[PDB]
């Protein structure tokens, strides 16, 4: 309670209250709240100049040390800016931002510096003018990206402006740091070589240091389970130690390190627990908000105390001229590079350039650097002028540029809402309005709410729309069909995502392509544009093959023990020689000489044991030759040390590093192979998600448009485009399996578990929603799911492809029936086929089954109408042997192929032999039945909200009826959902109407009767309601 109390708290706490007041009072007014904070800070400053008591509270901030200002606020501002943004659209447009942020910053700064030299009468030198330019070129576009996120062009113009701001803020501090030393801390004139190393440290070592710290950080985040506090604390510690260690100890650019760390930790959001990801965004937003309020408050105080005392009348004239100049300079730079930017990324239109030119608001980062000059100036007038102009420009930009950006967007015609969005919002609002009427009518019947005031209720719950054969005939219908197709596709991608079938990156790629296609004439989604997702860069296969060659050459303990021995031996090999470089402690240092002999003996025993185990074959492996040369050198230098100028010592210093530490590469190379596998896996995993998402999208939409577009000539074209896309996608993804078998298996197993766990989570919420499972108990199981989700990210990047005999075990109708697996495995024969060979042809009798264990085969049949590709795991000929009808399609190998062949005679014997309740006949028809059934139920369900998987899960509940038990079937709405005829022909009992084999049965039909025939025996599939 004495005067020693921390008076900084009242300021920090008071700043939060003032920020809240300014943010709430001016929420609907156009002027940003940050300007109000500057005025409040000025009021506080003039007050503090007159009432001593308040001065005691501002003192600890209004005269804050620069090397606490920068070390605390800047890492927060830069990390939040890096952590908040969309990295993937940023990386897919990286070069355009780099061109306009690095080189754009240089020209903008130099031009501002020249202006500051020539116009202003302050007689500044080029170092000071470059500090001025660096401060004046730092942008804070938050107020503009916020609008662009809502109105439109969010994935194009929002990211470039935000990324440009991020990079220009990062580089401005570097320039400001460089020129601050040459102004306030001038050293002796450095050599050109010294300067070059200085450039490498700030420019190259910074990003490398940040990259290393990030890759270490994400590694540990991936191994933290059920501990959110540790994750948040690790993020904080990593971000603050990256700046401190990089800036103070390593003499490396801290800001750029944090930029890279934030970007990487954003890109690897999957390694963070989902519940902590949603917390980190709000946490860093809050820290940045605190930082901004303090900077504006401090600026408001210090300008009033010690900046405005030195402003002359002509200084205002320069401020206006400077404001005009930097705005002109920014637009000049954007236009001058515009020819270059037009060729890379999303080129800038003239209206986009104006928004960027007008949207370049200045903010805290600029002001923070101005406070450094004010403090380091030591009451030299340079400090006042720096802070005066930086505050002036910020106020002008916030009062003029920010307050008119919305009207400029309206004028330029970018604030309009597209008809599709307006219709979607209107329909959603109307549906919401209808839903409330249903609820209100239901509530009015409740006994305990009959006395409620329904006028107030109805007024309160209202939701209002926020946005409130001729050539021409054929051209218009084509456009309507095209846009309706694209809109249906976008719906499918969202349904797939909401049910966990796609990762978000695949969703955003697919949606971006759909929207881009919508905006171009006669443009559908082109698989050639999607191909970039699953193209593997050539460097990684090459590295994998080379590194496997290096490592593809007895006890378990030797390698681990010795590798530990080496990794520890770095400690002597550093601490002796580094201190010897200073001695050039001897009472202690000689102990390391003695222990060096013990390490020699360790490696010697290792070599002796290895020679004994390998015997004469020790020389066969080149890796061991180095293992012997190391011992030779160690013995040689030990003899010199024991038995006997500098050549006897410096040689030791060098050799006991060179031949000492390079033998860890044996252990390392496998880790590099794993990293390379991971890089391929991350690209191949995205490829499958995008490709498979596209195929599902096309299959779902193709069943919709049959009931949306009237003109058949339009209808044929659209379904032609969908099919020519589907085939190319399924082929490209099929080939990648042959290129990278094990990584494909890893991807496919990872998708499988990801699906199982998601559906597992739904059952918990169903049980929790039904009250069978308490809230806490459900939470305890839901954690077990989420930990298992996080362990998938750490699963091996390659699973060795199972041998052919394993695939038979995992076939659907062979699963779990050992006596049948043994029967088939014995009689199943493996066949090899070369490229272009036909396995079977149309019209051939059904000789047997083919189980593709490797390769890719092309199906082509007249049933050119039919065309498809099948790959590992799929089985060909099931319909054939069951019905004994001829082949459906010709099968051609697109790659060297292996197939397990089971003769139709073996199948018939197996069908006769294995006749328990889950009969092999029942199983083979069930697997066939669902494939035939799924298209029909999906065609019926086309208008409704299910995905294809919910249609399958709906079908999996079904069963085949034993029409031998009763040769007629009757339907009941209360206990039966739908019925599908799979093979045969069926008669409605009341009319004997012809229903042919593939038909789905209409719900009006009551009773079905069949003809007792053997040649086309009736097979029928049925699904009961969940209540049986």
Numbering used by the authors: 70 to 537, 570 to 654, 676 to 706, 725 to 784, 794 to 1012, 1030 to 1194
From the reporting publication:
A general observation, evident from the local resolution maps, is that in all of our SpSLC9C1 structures the protein displays substantial structural heterogeneity for most of its domains except for the TD, which indicates that it might be locked. Focused 3D classifications at the dimer level could not resolve the conformational flexibility, which suggests that the movements of the domains are, to a degree, independent within the dimer. Therefore, focused heterogeneity analysis at the protomer level with a mask excluding the TD was performed instead. For the apo dataset, four conformations with a resolution range of 3.2–3.4 Å and with substantially improved densities of all the domains could be distinguished. The most pronounced differences are confined to the region of the CHs. They are accompanied by subtle conformational transitions in the VSD and CNBD, which further indicates that the CHs might play a central role in coupling voltage sensing and cAMP modulation to exchange activity in the TD. In line with this assumption, the extended cytoplasmic region of S4 forms several interaction areas with CHs, which have to rearrange upon voltage activation.
One example is the sperm-specific SLC9C1 that belongs to the SLC9 superfamily of cation/proton antiporters, known as Na+/H+ exchangers (NHEs), which are essential for the regulation of intracellular pH, sodium homeostasis and cell volume. The transport domain (TD) is accompanied by a voltage-sensing domain (VSD) and a cyclic-nucleotide binding domain (CNBD), which are regulatory units usually found in voltage-gated cyclic-nucleotide-modulated ion channels, also referred to as CNBD ion channels. In a recent patch-clamp fluorimetry study, the functional integrity of the domains was confirmed for SLC9C1 from the sea urchin Strongylocentrotus purpuratus, termed SpSLC9C1, identifying it as a Na+/H+ exchanger that is activated strictly by hyperpolarization and modulated by cyclic nucleotides (cNMPs). Specifically, SpSLC9C1 adapted to mediate cellular alkalization in sperm only in response to chemoattractant-induced hyperpolarization.
